[PDB]
Subunit: 306 residues, 2 copies
Amino acid sequence: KWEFLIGNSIDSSPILAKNGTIYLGSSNKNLYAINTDGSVKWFFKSGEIIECRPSIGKDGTIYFGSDKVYAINPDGTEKWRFDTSDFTIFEDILYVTSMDGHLYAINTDGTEKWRFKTKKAIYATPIVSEDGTIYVGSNDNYLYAINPDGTEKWRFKTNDAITSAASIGKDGTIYFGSDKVYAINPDGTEKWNFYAGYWTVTRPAISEDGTIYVTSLDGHLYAINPDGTEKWRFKTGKRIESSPVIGNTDTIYFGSYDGHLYAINPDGTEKWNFETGSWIIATPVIDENGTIYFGTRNGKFYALFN
Amino acid sequence: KWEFLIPILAKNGTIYLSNKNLYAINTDGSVKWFFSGEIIECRPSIGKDGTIYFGSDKVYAINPDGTEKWRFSDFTIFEDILYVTSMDGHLYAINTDGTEKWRFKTKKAIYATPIVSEDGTIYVGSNDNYLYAINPDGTEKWRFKTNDAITSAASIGKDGTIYFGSDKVYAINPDGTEKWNFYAGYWTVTRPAISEDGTIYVTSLDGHLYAINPDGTEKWRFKTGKRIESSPVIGNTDTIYFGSYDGHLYAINPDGTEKWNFETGSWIIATPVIDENGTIYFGTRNGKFYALFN
């Protein structure tokens, strides 16, 4: 209303980064500010921020590093600051998938540019590469590469439904999971595949040095080399249902379903672990400051600083 | 209780919230909202010609502020036991202390919400195309094979018939034998809504709202020309409501005739819900909410 007189602003939505990460967008605008001395100033009531004390290993050893972990329990009025997708917008075009099996390309006004049909329902989040190619998997077991004009560049057959978004390395290699982890070349040919102990339902995280990290329902964080060989695996006692996230210092973070948070060094050794006591199912997100957030089922969220 | 973890999904298919933080009914009959310029009443239409609607039904558009959103799954709790599904393909029975009572493994990831019948039997579908009937002890009572992944919850009718959909809509007898199946012009991805009369309602990605008789025969269909990605909800007036993906809301009478329709202009994907007052809520993608009053 009164657009010709009063300005308006669209809400900030999280965007899936090609490296497999998910950036808040609004970053910490509504969450916190960084003091000159480096301290963190949370925009929440005094008695809702609790600094956690991570451990190292299981012997009870206390973690004493640069990483800081905070437990935030926002009041109902504060829930909006942090939301405890089936679409992606690219160059004024909305790419949204549908359980009807089609990938839809919608204009700003909401009209349909074109639609691409797959044989089964799609539950995966679509991603768009630099050259406009849209990558998305379907319950029909295929990963599709669709051109900007809605035509099929190619498709890659797997042995299981693709319900997670794909990741793209600097190289251009496309990484995704179904019956196993797959690395596909820009032209649609397979570079290699790796079985992470279970079918894959989360997005792979791509490091700067090229390492591909994938969490697995088998209770392990796997580190895969660019050539598809296993670098190492880190064992947890609980299934991991969400993707891992890479911190500003190359540390890899993730949490098992029971809310057990883990920080792993690139060499595969544990940096720290922390039991929140709160089940989690949502994937972690990161802001422009590298701060990582783990939202819990019970309304709270844990923020990790570096 | 379940602090580590924390609406009810009725067996008929409806989801209940419960509204004390939303509104209040005025003596004369009006409604007092707890949000001024955020609440706007809408005037429904009838058909496409242009007829305006002015019946007992009332629809309100709600655009709450970020600090007001508080005012308004993969698990179910039954008799102090947490039943939660996993993408690892298992249905888990969890104790109050968080310990595992048992786990039941299916061949593929499970994305459907589990439901528990009154006698304790758990019903849940899997991407392995089977609907599973699990006993309280974690033992398999039976399973029913379909041709596509089951990704939505099942509904149970008064006579115990279990309804769910995958490649098509299926009606299953408590003993696991198929009573009948019905193809709603597209594979099914939302749960059926069962009326008091036993009529089975289901929305379709083909743009229709289908009404199925207890015997499996089609009672009627309502076309919208727009794919429906959310389940239908039945109000206290036996009226059936639903919304197409583009946020076009519809109210259909039990006989198949349209009661009224309102173009929201806001895409909808979430399933509608109802409160203890019979008020139906439709959450939109852009953060707004539309309250329907009987």
